[PDB]
Design an enzyme around this catalytic site. Sequence first.
Site, PDB file in Angstrom:
ATOM      1  N   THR A  53      17.289   6.505  -8.273  1.00 39.69           N
ATOM      2  CA  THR A  53      17.943   5.875  -9.446  1.00 39.69           C
ATOM      3  C   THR A  53      18.134   4.352  -9.324  1.00 39.69           C
ATOM      4  N   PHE A  75      -0.129   7.528 -22.400  1.00 40.40           N
ATOM      5  CA  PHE A  75       0.993   7.741 -23.324  1.00 40.40           C
ATOM      6  C   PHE A  75       1.766   9.056 -23.143  1.00 40.40           C
ATOM      7  N   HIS A  77       3.239   9.658 -20.513  1.00 45.15           N
ATOM      8  CA  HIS A  77       4.411   9.244 -19.725  1.00 45.15           C
ATOM      9  C   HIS A  77       5.537   8.865 -20.658  1.00 45.15           C
ATOM     10  N   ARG A  78       6.447   9.807 -20.823  1.00 50.51           N
ATOM     11  CA  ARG A  78       7.490   9.745 -21.831  1.00 50.51           C
ATOM     12  C   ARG A  78       8.644   8.815 -21.502  1.00 50.51           C
ATOM     13  N   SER A  86      -1.110  -2.486 -34.311  1.00 46.84           N
ATOM     14  CA  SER A  86      -1.312  -1.991 -35.607  1.00 46.84           C
ATOM     15  C   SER A  86      -1.737  -3.175 -36.467  1.00 46.84           C
ATOM     16  N   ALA A 162      10.772   0.765 -12.531  1.00 47.86           N
ATOM     17  CA  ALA A 162      10.043   1.020 -11.265  1.00 47.86           C
ATOM     18  C   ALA A 162      10.001   2.475 -10.868  1.00 47.86           C
ATOM     19  N   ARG A 172      -1.606   9.099 -11.501  1.00 49.62           N
ATOM     20  CA  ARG A 172      -2.813   8.392 -11.948  1.00 49.62           C
ATOM     21  C   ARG A 172      -3.561   7.625 -10.838  1.00 49.62           C
TER      22      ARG A 172
HETATM   23  C1  LIG Z   1      23.545  14.491  -2.548  1.00 53.53           C
HETATM   24  C2  LIG Z   1      23.690  13.534  -3.732  1.00 53.53           C
HETATM   25  C3  LIG Z   1      24.284  12.154  -3.522  1.00 53.53           C
HETATM   26  C4  LIG Z   1      24.407  11.242  -4.748  1.00 53.53           C
HETATM   27  N1  LIG Z   1      24.965   9.911  -4.576  1.00 53.53           N
HETATM   28  C5  LIG Z   1      25.046   9.073  -5.756  1.00 53.53           C
HETATM   29  C6  LIG Z   1      25.609   7.686  -5.781  1.00 53.53           C
HETATM   30  O1  LIG Z   1      26.005   7.201  -4.719  1.00 53.53           O
HETATM   31  N2  LIG Z   1      25.651   7.018  -6.966  1.00 53.53           N
HETATM   32  C7  LIG Z   1      25.199   7.533  -8.140  1.00 53.53           C
HETATM   33  O2  LIG Z   1      25.270   6.895  -9.180  1.00 53.53           O
HETATM   34  N3  LIG Z   1      24.715   8.708  -8.235  1.00 53.53           N
HETATM   35  C8  LIG Z   1      24.583   9.616  -7.090  1.00 53.53           C
HETATM   36  N4  LIG Z   1      24.026  10.980  -7.185  1.00 53.53           N
HETATM   37  C9  LIG Z   1      23.574  11.413  -8.518  1.00 53.53           C
HETATM   38  C10 LIG Z   1      22.089  11.033  -8.567  1.00 53.53           C
HETATM   39  O3  LIG Z   1      21.920   9.633  -8.280  1.00 53.53           O
HETATM   40  C11 LIG Z   1      21.434  11.314  -9.924  1.00 53.53           C
HETATM   41  O4  LIG Z   1      22.000  10.493 -10.944  1.00 53.53           O
HETATM   42  C12 LIG Z   1      21.616  12.757 -10.354  1.00 53.53           C
HETATM   43  O5  LIG Z   1      21.341  13.599  -9.227  1.00 53.53           O
HETATM   44  C13 LIG Z   1      20.674  13.074 -11.503  1.00 53.53           C
HETATM   45  O6  LIG Z   1      19.360  13.032 -10.968  1.00 53.53           O
HETATM   46  P1  LIG Z   1      18.043  12.727 -11.831  1.00 53.53           P
HETATM   47  O7  LIG Z   1      18.147  11.254 -12.162  1.00 53.53           O
HETATM   48  O8  LIG Z   1      16.871  13.259 -11.010  1.00 53.53           O
HETATM   49  O9  LIG Z   1      18.188  13.763 -13.096  1.00 53.53           O
HETATM   50  P2  LIG Z   1      17.907  13.446 -14.663  1.00 53.53           P
HETATM   51  O10 LIG Z   1      18.825  12.281 -14.970  1.00 53.53           O
HETATM   52  O11 LIG Z   1      17.886  14.785 -15.463  1.00 53.53           O
HETATM   53  O12 LIG Z   1      16.352  13.028 -14.651  1.00 53.53           O
HETATM   54  C14 LIG Z   1      15.374  14.020 -14.297  1.00 53.53           C
HETATM   55  C15 LIG Z   1      14.019  13.368 -14.010  1.00 53.53           C
HETATM   56  O13 LIG Z   1      13.662  12.510 -15.093  1.00 53.53           O
HETATM   57  C16 LIG Z   1      13.270  11.208 -14.688  1.00 53.53           C
HETATM   58  N5  LIG Z   1      14.119  10.246 -15.470  1.00 53.53           N
HETATM   59  C17 LIG Z   1      15.060  10.547 -16.386  1.00 53.53           C
HETATM   60  N6  LIG Z   1      15.573   9.434 -16.979  1.00 53.53           N
HETATM   61  C18 LIG Z   1      14.938   8.377 -16.402  1.00 53.53           C
HETATM   62  C19 LIG Z   1      14.965   6.992 -16.543  1.00 53.53           C
HETATM   63  N7  LIG Z   1      15.831   6.423 -17.427  1.00 53.53           N
HETATM   64  N8  LIG Z   1      14.137   6.237 -15.776  1.00 53.53           N
HETATM   65  C20 LIG Z   1      13.250   6.749 -14.888  1.00 53.53           C
HETATM   66  N9  LIG Z   1      13.144   8.081 -14.715  1.00 53.53           N
HETATM   67  C21 LIG Z   1      13.957   8.927 -15.436  1.00 53.53           C
HETATM   68  C22 LIG Z   1      13.283  11.230 -13.168  1.00 53.53           C
HETATM   69  O14 LIG Z   1      11.940  11.295 -12.647  1.00 53.53           O
HETATM   70  C23 LIG Z   1      13.983  12.518 -12.755  1.00 53.53           C
HETATM   71  O15 LIG Z   1      13.252  13.238 -11.757  1.00 53.53           O
HETATM   72  C24 LIG Z   1      23.926  11.726  -6.114  1.00 53.53           C
HETATM   73  C25 LIG Z   1      23.370  13.099  -6.188  1.00 53.53           C
HETATM   74  C26 LIG Z   1      23.256  13.925  -5.128  1.00 53.53           C
HETATM   75  C27 LIG Z   1      22.667  15.283  -5.404  1.00 53.53           C
HETATM   76  C1  LIG Z   2      -2.832  19.048 -11.342  1.00 61.66           C
HETATM   77  C2  LIG Z   2      -2.357  18.787 -12.763  1.00 61.66           C
HETATM   78  C3  LIG Z   2      -3.084  19.487 -13.897  1.00 61.66           C
HETATM   79  C4  LIG Z   2      -2.570  19.191 -15.292  1.00 61.66           C
HETATM   80  N1  LIG Z   2      -3.231  19.852 -16.389  1.00 61.66           N
HETATM   81  C5  LIG Z   2      -2.724  19.541 -17.711  1.00 61.66           C
HETATM   82  C6  LIG Z   2      -3.241  20.115 -18.974  1.00 61.66           C
HETATM   83  O1  LIG Z   2      -4.185  20.909 -18.894  1.00 61.66           O
HETATM   84  N2  LIG Z   2      -2.647  19.721 -20.146  1.00 61.66           N
HETATM   85  C7  LIG Z   2      -1.595  18.875 -20.243  1.00 61.66           C
HETATM   86  O2  LIG Z   2      -1.100  18.567 -21.346  1.00 61.66           O
HETATM   87  N3  LIG Z   2      -1.080  18.339 -19.222  1.00 61.66           N
HETATM   88  C8  LIG Z   2      -1.560  18.599 -17.864  1.00 61.66           C
HETATM   89  N4  LIG Z   2      -0.945  17.989 -16.695  1.00 61.66           N
HETATM   90  C9  LIG Z   2       0.204  17.096 -16.988  1.00 61.66           C
HETATM   91  C10 LIG Z   2      -0.344  15.745 -17.384  1.00 61.66           C
HETATM   92  O3  LIG Z   2      -0.632  15.091 -16.161  1.00 61.66           O
HETATM   93  C11 LIG Z   2       0.652  14.908 -18.206  1.00 61.66           C
HETATM   94  O4  LIG Z   2      -0.142  13.898 -18.857  1.00 61.66           O
HETATM   95  C12 LIG Z   2       1.704  14.230 -17.327  1.00 61.66           C
HETATM   96  O5  LIG Z   2       1.972  15.020 -16.169  1.00 61.66           O
HETATM   97  C13 LIG Z   2       3.096  13.974 -17.896  1.00 61.66           C
HETATM   98  O6  LIG Z   2       3.798  13.500 -16.718  1.00 61.66           O
HETATM   99  P1  LIG Z   2       5.396  13.503 -16.464  1.00 61.66           P
HETATM  100  O7  LIG Z   2       5.937  14.513 -17.446  1.00 61.66           O
HETATM  101  O8  LIG Z   2       5.611  13.583 -14.970  1.00 61.66           O
HETATM  102  O9  LIG Z   2       5.849  12.020 -16.842  1.00 61.66           O
HETATM  103  P2  LIG Z   2       6.988  11.571 -17.878  1.00 61.66           P
HETATM  104  O10 LIG Z   2       6.668  12.157 -19.232  1.00 61.66           O
HETATM  105  O11 LIG Z   2       7.122  10.032 -17.668  1.00 61.66           O
HETATM  106  O12 LIG Z   2       8.382  12.182 -17.285  1.00 61.66           O
HETATM  107  C14 LIG Z   2       8.778  11.624 -16.022  1.00 61.66           C
HETATM  108  C15 LIG Z   2       9.571  12.627 -15.197  1.00 61.66           C
HETATM  109  O13 LIG Z   2      10.723  12.904 -15.998  1.00 61.66           O
HETATM  110  C16 LIG Z   2      10.888  14.311 -16.162  1.00 61.66           C
HETATM  111  N5  LIG Z   2      10.865  14.689 -17.601  1.00 61.66           N
HETATM  112  C17 LIG Z   2      10.644  13.886 -18.658  1.00 61.66           C
HETATM  113  N6  LIG Z   2      10.824  14.545 -19.810  1.00 61.66           N
HETATM  114  C18 LIG Z   2      11.161  15.815 -19.496  1.00 61.66           C
HETATM  115  C19 LIG Z   2      11.454  16.969 -20.226  1.00 61.66           C
HETATM  116  N7  LIG Z   2      11.439  16.930 -21.581  1.00 61.66           N
HETATM  117  N8  LIG Z   2      11.781  18.086 -19.554  1.00 61.66           N
HETATM  118  C20 LIG Z   2      11.824  18.124 -18.192  1.00 61.66           C
HETATM  119  N9  LIG Z   2      11.532  17.047 -17.416  1.00 61.66           N
HETATM  120  C21 LIG Z   2      11.194  15.892 -18.026  1.00 61.66           C
HETATM  121  C22 LIG Z   2       9.899  15.006 -15.289  1.00 61.66           C
HETATM  122  O14 LIG Z   2      10.613  15.474 -14.137  1.00 61.66           O
HETATM  123  C23 LIG Z   2       8.858  13.958 -14.950  1.00 61.66           C
HETATM  124  O15 LIG Z   2       8.447  14.185 -13.602  1.00 61.66           O
HETATM  125  C24 LIG Z   2      -1.395  18.240 -15.510  1.00 61.66           C
HETATM  126  C25 LIG Z   2      -0.787  17.609 -14.318  1.00 61.66           C
HETATM  127  C26 LIG Z   2      -1.213  17.853 -13.064  1.00 61.66           C
HETATM  128  C27 LIG Z   2      -0.483  17.151 -11.961  1.00 61.66           C
END
Ligand SMILES: Cc1cc2nc3c(=O)[nH]c(=O)nc-3n(C[C@H](O)[C@H](O)[C@H](O)COP(=O)(O)OP(=O)(O)OC[C@H]3O[C@@H](n4cnc5c(N)ncnc54)[C@H](O)[C@@H]3O)c2cc1C
Ligand SMILES: Cc1cc2nc3c(=O)[nH]c(=O)nc-3n(C[C@H](O)[C@H](O)[C@H](O)COP(=O)(O)OP(=O)(O)OC[C@H]3O[C@@H](n4cnc5c(N)ncnc54)[C@H](O)[C@@H]3O)c2cc1C
Lengths: 216, 219, 218, 212
Positions: A53, A75, A77-78, A86, A162, A172
């Site tokens: 984070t 695109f 990548h949400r 446009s 980042a 990618r």
């Molecule tokens: C053991 C432990 C110690 C912790 N210590 C701290 C601390 O010191 N301070 C603190 O603030 N929090 C702390 N946390 C909370 C932690 O930092 C996360 O905020 C919390 O676990 C939610 O995690 P997440 O961001 O993966 O989940 P979500 O917020 O549901 O996001 C899920 C996934 O979506 C992606 N994602 C969602 N939104 C964004 C975004 N805006 N930008 C980029 N990627 C995004 C990420 O890839 C992530 O894997 C701690 C948690 C644990 C379990």
């Molecule tokens: C081996 C392989 C085969 C694949 N085959 C296909 C295919 O056939 N068709 C296809 O459409 N795609 C396929 N994918 C997925 C494809 O790569 C997508 O374009 C891409 O993975 C979207 O990436 P992301 O969701 O990690 O990134 P983001 O959309 O940037 O999300 C970033 C992170 O945030 C979390 N996140 C964001 N939004 C949500 C949400 N709504 N719920 C839960 N978590 C969320 C996730 O933890 C994710 O890791 C494949 C991927 C892999 C790795």
Amino acid sequence: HMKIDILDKGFVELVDVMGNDLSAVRAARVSFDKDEERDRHLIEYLMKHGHETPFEHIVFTFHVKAPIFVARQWFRHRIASYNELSGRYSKLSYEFYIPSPERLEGYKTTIPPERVTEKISEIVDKAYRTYLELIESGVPRRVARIVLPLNLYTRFFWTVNARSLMNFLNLRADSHAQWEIQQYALAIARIFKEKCPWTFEAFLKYAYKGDILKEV
Amino acid sequence: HMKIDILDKGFVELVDVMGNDLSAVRAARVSFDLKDEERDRHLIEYLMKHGHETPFEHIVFTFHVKAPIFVARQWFRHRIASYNELSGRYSKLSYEFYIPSPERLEGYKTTIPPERVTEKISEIVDKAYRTYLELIESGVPRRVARIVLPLNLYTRFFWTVNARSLMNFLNLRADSHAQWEIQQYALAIARIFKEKCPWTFEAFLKYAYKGDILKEVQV
Amino acid sequence: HHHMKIDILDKGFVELVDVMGNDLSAVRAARVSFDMGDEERDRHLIEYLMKHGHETPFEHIVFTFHVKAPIFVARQWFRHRIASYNELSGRYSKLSYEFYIPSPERLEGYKTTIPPERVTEKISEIVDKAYRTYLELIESGVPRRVARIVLPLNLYTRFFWTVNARSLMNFLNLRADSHAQWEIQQYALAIARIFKEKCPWTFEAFLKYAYKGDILKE
Amino acid sequence: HMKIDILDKGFVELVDVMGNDLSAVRAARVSFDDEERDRHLIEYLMKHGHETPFEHIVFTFHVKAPIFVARQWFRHRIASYNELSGLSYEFYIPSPERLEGYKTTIPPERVTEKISEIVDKAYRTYLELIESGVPRRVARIVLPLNLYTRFFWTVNARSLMNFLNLRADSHAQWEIQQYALAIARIFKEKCPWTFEAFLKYAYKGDILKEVQ
Ligand SMILES: Cc1cc2nc3c(=O)[nH]c(=O)nc-3n(C[C@H](O)[C@H](O)[C@H](O)COP(=O)(O)OP(=O)(O)OC[C@H]3O[C@@H](n4cnc5c(N)ncnc54)[C@H](O)[C@@H]3O)c2cc1C
Ligand SMILES: Cc1cc2nc3c(=O)[nH]c(=O)nc-3n(C[C@H](O)[C@H](O)[C@H](O)COP(=O)(O)OP(=O)(O)OC[C@H]3O[C@@H](n4cnc5c(N)ncnc54)[C@H](O)[C@@H]3O)c2cc1C
Ligand SMILES: Cc1cc2nc3c(=O)[nH]c(=O)nc-3n(C[C@H](O)[C@H](O)[C@H](O)COP(=O)(O)OP(=O)(O)OC[C@H]3O[C@@H](n4cnc5c(N)ncnc54)[C@H](O)[C@@H]3O)c2cc1C
């Protein structure tokens, strides 16, 4: 002032960046108010433990010119912000990605590599000529363009933190992604490395799940 | 540079900013260049007037916020944003509590003097904290002992948020339906926003903002 | 049992795969309760939530759709980030190659310098040429991922889309509008139709208080 | 509704579920149309990191938890939450056994009693202030962080698995660990194949590999 040409007519350009490695350190410590080696240690500590984070407070804006088939994968990548060119705000141009013969060296085709290129070029020209004929006859642009190929270039701004950039790179910047998106990924990686070297190095070291950033 | 004190011990501090109004203009056109101020200002209004909000996502703020937990919990409901709260395995914790002023409490018809209410809150906060310290000096780990501490304990966080999501926050929080305390923070966030992106903020007020207070209370 | 299918364009469609909840799921969420429907009072709460922009309860209603649409439609569709998408690939099932050819009537409207039928025919011919070029490259040993870049933007794709009622209302505000491209509006009309069938109180409240487009009122 | 009791007054309860393991299979194949074939694809997706099909399995939970737990929980942004607004007043009192483990200077039963006493004083002070005419959303600020709250939580299976990676783990506080184990129990009951695949391939925590 940082621009990398990609493919035959594409690019990635850095538009803006908010912060640097120290922005994730500040965020982690929750402190606005120097020790280089302890700061790096923390960045490394955050990465190897999955405390990702803090890297969310480093933001980039890129300007990308890419074929539609690349943009469609990109695109997906949400967790980022996109604006696509446009005609409504600025002028459109029509340019196409024509693969080089080297690009198809690898595969062992019936038809020389240069003949593949030429066939792709031919379709582009016929499809674009048909588009223009349709425009001149009164078919609106929005309808006429549906005959254009997926290698038509588009441009977009992409703002991304980042953390989301590291996820992008994991998926990618890998030898299983298609080659065209690998090249863009490599460019994204280079800019990120230039602006945030400690984060990038820690990323390669602990988190990075792919391959091509550990070669080229 | 920019720090605004809020409540008795709170603040909102600007840590960093990416872009300005023209960042939204450049995103909408998709070019990184031939500036024309009237043209670019019209474009901002245009976007805000017709709901083309996405170009405003390319302006980004990081804020350092010190606020009571009850305020922070309302705040952390805004999911389109990045948060980091002080823990701290990373930095030192301190213990300060929000005590509403008697002035905060007049307007309410209560059976006891507003100052008496101040006194009672202060006293219960003091006892809770003393018990906490007591539990700590006894060997009870902090993460357990702290559950007796009240909701008016101050916490700190970094908040990174783009201007679109910041406009949604202000729609909800800079409004007389919100609790008075978070209104105060949202007014401070609005002042910094205006200072950094004056054209967008003005266009926001004019076309998009659904709250009441910002169009009355300057800045 | 939930299942609906509406045909769109020449070969497209929108198919309801599943739904979680109903109008009362939003009421339960708002109250944090297990109320099961007092109808006057639950409808009044739906209007209430909708009127005042308290949309979070509508997030607890969820749809999964299966959409077949041209790539140019799918690109604008996929711009909706608060949602889940999975697009058809050849790794898990059969790829098919079909294309959207607009009808003459669609092309009436405009005062074109050739009859609408000839416009339709020109589109068919260039699509046919591209496709045959695609097949010739595949027969030559060109990998599909490269050969396919000559295919036009009217190539149909399929995807599953899972989306909550709140994000679906935002989708309809933007796409169910006489400014969106006509093909987009057609798909938005089918999504609306299903939304109404499944969440009639939410839908009627959305139309009255929140809906910003023009074509759903028609 | 599957309801699991957690802590002294808490719970997790399943409100509704969309889909099951086959929802991810249909999503992956992109088809509204053989049990081991389908189990094999689930494992394949999880193993190769294709997680997006698991986003088409959705759960709605009803959770009663202390505020300190709910704050940690609400940090999970890729979910939908609705919290109770306006109410009842209950507080989580740790058991003695919770506090054994560390050498403390007083017996763990005394520590429990000391928590209970300060809770009662605080709640008493809250009730006097309401009695006096202080609005509730001002008065409530003196209540401690162990006050229970209730919320609905709608989350998809992919995001559910990220939540378990972080909370169903020895590094999270013991209390949210308890809620995570319960969320896991329900997930496994409704999606046995996704959940088994998750443990075997994607899950980065510890406790679910040995707490059945
Ligand atoms: C053991 C432990 C110690 C912790 N210590 C701290 C601390 O010191 N301070 C603190 O603030 N929090 C702390 N946390 C909370 C932690 O930092 C996360 O905020 C919390 O676990 C939610 O995690 P997440 O961001 O993966 O989940 P979500 O917020 O549901 O996001 C899920 C996934 O979506 C992606 N994602 C969602 N939104 C964004 C975004 N805006 N930008 C980029 N990627 C995004 C990420 O890839 C992530 O894997 C701690 C948690 C644990 C379990
Ligand atoms: C081996 C392989 C085969 C694949 N085959 C296909 C295919 O056939 N068709 C296809 O459409 N795609 C396929 N994918 C997925 C494809 O790569 C997508 O374009 C891409 O993975 C979207 O990436 P992301 O969701 O990690 O990134 P983001 O959309 O940037 O999300 C970033 C992170 O945030 C979390 N996140 C964001 N939004 C949500 C949400 N709504 N719920 C839960 N978590 C969320 C996730 O933890 C994710 O890791 C494949 C991927 C892999 C790795
Ligand atoms: C006066 C007031 C009273 C309140 N009362 C209660 C209460 O009783 N109970 C309670 O739980 N909360 C309550 N809240 C909190 C409120 O319900 C919202 O959670 C909070 O205001 C965040 O708003 P948001 O979701 O629009 O912002 P964000 O969470 O930043 O989202 C911004 C925009 O992004 C979109 N978005 C983000 N994630 C999703 C998603 N998963 N699905 C669809 N769209 C999404 C939406 O379009 C949204 O408008 C209250 C808030 C206010 C201001």
